[PDB]
Design a protein around this ligand. Structure first.
Ligand SMILES: OC[C@H]1O[C@H](O)[C@H](O[C@H]2O[C@H](CO)[C@@H](O)[C@H](O)[C@H]2O)[C@@H](O)[C@H]1O
Ligand SMILES: [Ca+2]
Ligand SMILES: [Mg+2]
Ligand SMILES: [Mg+2]
Ligand SMILES: [Mg+2]
Ligand SMILES: [Mg+2]
Length: 759
């Protein structure tokens, strides 16, 4: 019962700025979104917003922007006397509710979504005499604030002359129209987008500048219905009209559909009823968060998808990443499998095909970031779309979890060839030495290389910067060591491809940290990163590889090969199945032979050295760059031998390494490049934490895994409060950082609730 979980997240708020930001530039309120809609609503918090759901949040293609503080706010008059209401307002999974109570009149307002563009408000009015109803609204004027403090005197219309917002009256309500604004990082409109309000009863609407007042007279107790729709193109506007009319013709049908969908999510989702009430509430928060970050098809993305955060500065609209999706879809398989499937389809829908206009050399590649607007390179004006890199291979994992739940053979038939193409791309564009063990790297790209195919890098010395090109030049510069630091777009891209931006093992270390490392006996050269171009035999530039093979991606490709074999077997392709199982074993042998270090009892990336070692390994484990969460990836993925796993778990459980106040962070305390406030060099993310506990369980250490989960539950700050879910934690203090309403945290917190959290 959804009524059991009121106000899991604080959804109150009265925004006064289009960009009403917190310190980290995220919208500081948490609107309710559902069904993939492109608008959301907040709850009223006092007399000034009472009677309406303030802060109409609009998703303007790739960003969240507020429209109004009050919009369609109801006030009530009985024979010239204004009714004085007291307010009760709560959220539940799937709805916002507010109740206005006065002596002789009551109003109950329930707000749910009805289509992928339309929310539905029931306004149930109890009164034994006639009443005059008044709705009012005003469009926002002020542009931007941080923590309530305006940054400037700027107005929305001043910053955006072409926005040109106008309210018009219609036969059954009103609309706001918006002009075309192509503000790459802020505000993206087509010029055809509208916000429409349709009502079940006749109203008389007056318009004064950018505000309105609508009036209606009722005879007594009645229930009316209002639809709100944010429609982003002319085609959307046309198509929604018949749906709006059906909704206002059968509102009970839409309310019930939403009620029933959410009862299902909860019945399916909450499969550990012996968790404490506080633990169950965390699960429900996760479920609301994931479903709120779900977006229906829009622009270039022709499928429903789930973004990393609807309120996030850079994660909103329908901006979609691959490994976020794999994590999201794995979790969502267990309560919203329809949208899990869609999320996966969205990512693969822009997989590179033979004859691609931009990167024909990258067949099978899956873009890092897709969104409403294509990049200029593909004829759009989007600044987010990214094809510099992909993300790690967790796709088959996600796909097979969906099949295991749904048992839909059509689904495996659908995804198998895309997954195979993705696999083949890695071994063709990310395996320089041809040993079947992939490297992270970077695509041929305007950010990475000159037009002539030469790899870019910047040498820094004091205040001097010099930007150069060419791998032979790089090799020379690196050997001489005549610089303070290097910045290499390909390096950034490669770390992005791992998903662990600026991680230690990819050669990222602050200058003070690097000096300590040398003053204690280390060679500066240990932290220098080396590259190679990957070419076909006819000389075509395919991309770049780090001269380093990563133990996380090896481990993920190992599990991915097994999942592919299962899929091949399901589809009656026994020879393809056999090949994937054989490919998986070869990688297991390599991971255990090459990437395990028996001395420090841990797994690491290895270098691709000038010649391979005697045992066929490309090089030695990069033990000197320290231990990371990639080191338990062989356990999570099942590539590890029992003995190596036994070794790894001792390290994980060591307070000197990973067993911290919030355990299992992204770099061990012993890592030379550790920092408690560095996202992927110390901070604890819930995905890597969960991969760790699952890896432990798989090799017989569930008992210890349960203890870490309990430690996490007691020490991770904010967990049992009503704030939005964030991305990561200080391993020493447990303090939260990162975008609010963060999808994969929700996904892995949900999984932790199912698998590990207990009373
Ligand atoms: O613009 C490409 C770039 O975008 C993000 O900043 C990525 O960094 C984080 O965000 C995504 C989405 O949550 C995660 O998949 C990454 O693991 C995060 O580090 C960055 O890697 C690129 O994708
Ligand atoms: Ca290789
Ligand atoms: Mg680009
Ligand atoms: Mg980053
Ligand atoms: Mg199976
Ligand atoms: Mg085996």
């Amino acid at each position: 019962n959804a009524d059991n979980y009121k106000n899991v997240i604080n959804r109150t708020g009265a925004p006064q700025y289009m960009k009403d930001y917190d310190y980290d530039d995220h919208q500081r309120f948490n609107p309710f979104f559902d069904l993939g809609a492109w608008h959301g609503h907040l709850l009223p918090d006092g007399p000034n917003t009472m009677g309406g759901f303030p802060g109409v949040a609009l998703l303007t293609e790739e960003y969240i922007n507020f429209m109004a503080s009050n919009f369609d706010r109801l006030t009530v008059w009985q024979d010239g006397k204004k009714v004085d209401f007291t307010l009760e307002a709560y959220s539940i999974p799937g709805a916002l509710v507010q109740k206005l109570t006065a002596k002789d009149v009551q109003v109950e307002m329930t707000l749910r979504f009805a289509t992928p563009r339309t929310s539905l408000l029931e306004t149930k009015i109890t009164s034994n005499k006639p009443l005059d109803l008044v709705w009012d609204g005003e469009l926002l004027e002020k542009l931007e604030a941080k923590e309530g403090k305006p940054l400037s005197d700027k107005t929305i219309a001043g910053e955006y002359p072409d926005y040109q917002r106008k309210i018009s009256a219609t036969r059954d309500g009103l609309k706001v129209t918006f002009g075309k604004v192509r503000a790459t990082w802020d505000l993206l409109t087509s010029g055809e987008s509208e916000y429409q309000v349709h009502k079940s009863l006749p109203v008389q609407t007056e318009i004064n500048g950018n505000r309105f007042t609508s009036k209606a007279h009722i005879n007594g107790s009645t229930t009316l219905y209002t639809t709100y729709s944010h429609l982003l193109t002319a085609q959307e506007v046309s198509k929604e009209q018949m749906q709006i009319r059906d909704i206002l013709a059968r509102p009970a049908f839409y309310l019930t559909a939403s009620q029933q969908r959410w009862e299902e999510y909860l019945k399916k989702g909450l499969t550990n009823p012996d968790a404490t009430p506080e633990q169950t509430r965390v699960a429900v928060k996760a479920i609301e968060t994931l479903n709120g970050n779900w977006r229906s098809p829009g622009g270039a993305v022709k499928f429903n998808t789930v973004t990393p955060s609807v309120t996030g500065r850079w994660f909103s609209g329908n901006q979609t990443w691959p490994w976020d999706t794999w994590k999201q879809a794995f979790a969502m398989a267990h309560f919203n499998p329809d949208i899990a499937k869609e999320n996966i389809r969205a990512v693969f829908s822009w997989q590179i095909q033979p004859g691609d206009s931009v990167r024909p050399q990258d067949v099978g590649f899956v873009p890092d970031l897709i969104a409403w607007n294509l990049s200029p390179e593909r004829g759009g004006d989007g600044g987010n779309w990214n094809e510099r890199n992909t993300k790690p291979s967790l796709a088959a994992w996600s796909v097979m979890e969906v099949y295991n739940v749904t048992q839909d053979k059509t689904w495996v038939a659908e995804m198998y060839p895309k997954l195979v193409a993705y696999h083949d791309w890695w071994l063709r564009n990310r395996d320089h030495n041809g040993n079947g063990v992939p490297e992270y790297g970077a695509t041929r790209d305007k950010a990475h290389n000159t037009e002539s195919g030469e790899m870019l890098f910047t040498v820094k010395k004091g205040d001097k910067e010099e930007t150069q090109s060419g791998l032979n030049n790089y090799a020379r510069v690196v050997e001489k060591g005549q610089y303070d630091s290097l910045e290499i777009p390909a390096q950034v891209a490669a770390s992005w491809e791992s998903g662990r931006d600026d991680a230690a093992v990819f050669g990222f270390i602050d200058k003070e940290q690097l000096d300590k490392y040398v003053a204690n006996g280390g060679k500066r050269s240990d932290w220098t990163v080396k590259f190679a171009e990957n070419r076909s035999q006819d000389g075509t530039l395919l991309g770049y590889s780090l001269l380093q093979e990563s133990v996380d991606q090896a481990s993920y490709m190992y599990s991915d090969n097994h999942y592919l074999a299962e899929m091949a077997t399901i589809l009656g392709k026994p020879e393809e199945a056999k090949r994937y199982r054989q490919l998986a074993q070869q990688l297991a042998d390599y991971i255990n032979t090459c990437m395990f270090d028996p001395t420090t009892q841990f797994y690491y990336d290895v270098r691709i050295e000038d010649k391979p070692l005697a045992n066929g390994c490309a090089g030695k484990p990069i033990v000197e760059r320290g231990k990371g969460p990639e080191g338990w990836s062989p356990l999570f993925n099942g590539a590890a031998t029992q003995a190596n796993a036994d070794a790894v778990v001792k390290v994980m459980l060591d307070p000197k390494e990973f067993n911290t106040f919030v355990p299992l962070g992204t770099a061990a305390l012993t890592n030379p490049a550790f920092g408690a406030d560095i996202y992927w060099r110390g901070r604890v993310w819930v995905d890597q934490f969960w991969f760790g506990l699952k890896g432990m369980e798989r090799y017989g250490y569930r008992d210890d895994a349960l203890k870490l989960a309990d430690t996490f539950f007691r020490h991770a700050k904010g967990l049992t409060a009503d704030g939005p879910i964030q991305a990561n934690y200080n391993p020493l203090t447990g303090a939260q950082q990162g975008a609010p309403n963060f999808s994969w945290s929700a996904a892995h917190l949900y999984m932790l609730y199912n698998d590990f959290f207990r009373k």
